[PDB]
Amino acid sequence: RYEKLLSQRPEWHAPWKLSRVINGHLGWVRCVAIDPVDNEWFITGSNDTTMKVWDLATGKLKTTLAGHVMTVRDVAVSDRHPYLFSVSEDKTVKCWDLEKNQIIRDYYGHLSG
RNA sequence: AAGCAGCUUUACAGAUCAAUGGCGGAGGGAGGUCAACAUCAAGAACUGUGGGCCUUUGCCUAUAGAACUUAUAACGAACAUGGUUCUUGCCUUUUACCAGAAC
Numbered sequence A: 001r002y003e004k005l006l007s008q009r010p011e012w013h014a015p016w017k018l019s020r021v022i023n024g025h026l027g028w029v030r031c032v033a034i035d036p037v038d039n040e041w042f043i044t045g046s047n048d049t050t051m052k053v054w055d056l057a058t059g060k061l062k063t064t065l066a067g068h069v070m071t072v073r074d075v076a077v078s079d080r081h082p083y084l085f086s087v088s089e090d091k092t093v094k095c096w097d098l099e100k101n102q103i104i105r106d107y108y109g110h111l112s113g
Numbered sequence B: 001a002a003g004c005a006g007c008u009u010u011a012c013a014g015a016u017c018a019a020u021g022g023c024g025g026a027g028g029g030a031g032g033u034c035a036a037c038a039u040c041a042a043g044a045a046c047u048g049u050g051g052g053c054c055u056u057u058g059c060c061u062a063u064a065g066a067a068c069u070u071a072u073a074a075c076g077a078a079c080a081u082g083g084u085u086c087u088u089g090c091c092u093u094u095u096a097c098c099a100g101a102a103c
């Protein structure tokens, strides 16, 4: 097994460097989701109970999405829908109409966060 | 529109009393605080049918039919409630509330 690893060379990849630091939250950034279609913005749920939407190219802040009362743990953006799904430690799963930026279609049943 | 002729029918006397041609006829009418199924808010908006293009979709062209609803816009010349979210009001907590919005 060990002579077959030395027989093989890994693919070269280009290294990574920091290009932009964005300071906008009041707590920890706990989750990041990208726009799956057309790639203009990303959204960061956080520890200050609010999700912010950041433009990918310029780095400016587009909007803030409040509506959770505890820390937003994960954020998922849909490719087939204009829907944003967001869970938190406050036992809530929420949907968001991105054509309206309002909470629709709330989900219920998790015993904990 | 009286009257005459032409036309369409009509009670019919017919010609034919055949092959015909026209209209009607080859399982009703009125209803029911009966039922089922469709359908009832959108480029001012529908569908069937023929033709051509591309390769079925879509477009263009020709044609037929469009009930109900709608312009001081809506089936209802009528008018309640609930959910979420935002902003207020009441001010021990909650429910029940206050009264505007958006969905």
Ligand SMILES: [Mg+2]
Pocket: none
């Ligand atoms: Mg108590």
